């Protein structure tokens, strides 16, 4: 496993995540450890003016579901998120 390198510590009830799009567009969102895909997808899709379902979010190369638990998403302070090119965006 990769070295922990110490988390940011910048959290409380929610954690930080850097969403990186295929457009090379990184955006910093605050979400919970157990946050559902809708929270981010709705949020990102909204800021970009794109259909929510047209946005596809993947964590570490696996798709983020609203059913996924914080255990399995293992997200933490300022973690990274991968986004694939939206359907409507092209």
Swiss-Prot record:
List the PROSITE patterns.
Answer: UBIQUITIN_2 (PS50053)
**Name the UniProt record assigns to this protein:** Small ubiquitin-related modifier
Q: Supply the source organism for this entry.
A: Caenorhabditis elegans
Q: Which Pfam families match?
A: Rad60-SLD
Q: Any idea where this protein resides?
A: Cytoplasm; Nucleus; Cytoplasm, Cytoskeleton, Spindle; Chromosome
Disulphide bonds annotated for this chain are none
Q: Provide the phenotype resulting from gene inactivation.
A: RNAi-mediated knockdown reduces survival. RNAi-mediated knockdown disrupts tail tip morphogenesis resulting in retention of the pointed larval tail tip in adult males (also known as the Lep phenotype). RNAi-mediated knockdown causes chromosome misalignment and anaphase bridges during the first embryonic mitotic division. RNAi-mediated knockdown results in impaired locomotion in 23% of animals. RNAi-mediated knockdown results in ectopic expression of egl-17 in multiple vulva precursor cells and a moderate increase in phosphorylation of mpk-1.
From the record heading this protein, give the residue positions of the covalent cross-link Glycyl lysine isopeptide (Gly-Lys) (interchain with K-? in acceptor proteins). Answer: 90
SUPFAM superfamilies xrefs: Ubiquitin-like
What quaternary arrangement does the UniProt entry report?
Covalently attached to tbx-2. Covalently attached to lin-1. Covalently attached to lin-11. Covalently attached to sop-2. Covalently attached to bet-1.
Q: Which gene encodes it?
A: smo-1
Has the keyword Nucleus been applied to this entry? yes
Upper taxonomic classification of the species?
Answer: Eukaryota, Metazoa, Ecdysozoa, Nematoda, Chromadorea
Molecular functions (GO terms): identical protein binding; protein tag activity; ubiquitin-like protein ligase binding
| Processing and modification events after translation | Cleavage of precursor form by ulp-1 is necessary for function.
Q: Where is the Ubiquitin-like domain?
A: 13-90
Q: Does the keyword Cytoplasm apply?
A: yes
Q: Which family does it belong to?
A: Belongs to the ubiquitin family. SUMO subfamily.
């Amino acid at each position: 496993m990769a070295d922990d390198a110490a988390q940011a510590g910048d959290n409380a009830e929610y954690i930080k995540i850097k969403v990186v799009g295929q457009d090379s567009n990184e955006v910093h969102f605050r979400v919970k450890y157990g946050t559902s895909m809708a929270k981010l997808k709705k949020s990102y899709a909204d800021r970009t003016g794109v259909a929510v379902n047209s946005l596809r979010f993947l964590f570490d190369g696996r798709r983020i579901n609203d059913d996924d638990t914080p255990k399995t998403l293992e997200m933490e302070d300022d973690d990274v998120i991968e986004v694939y090119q939206e359907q409507l965006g092209g």
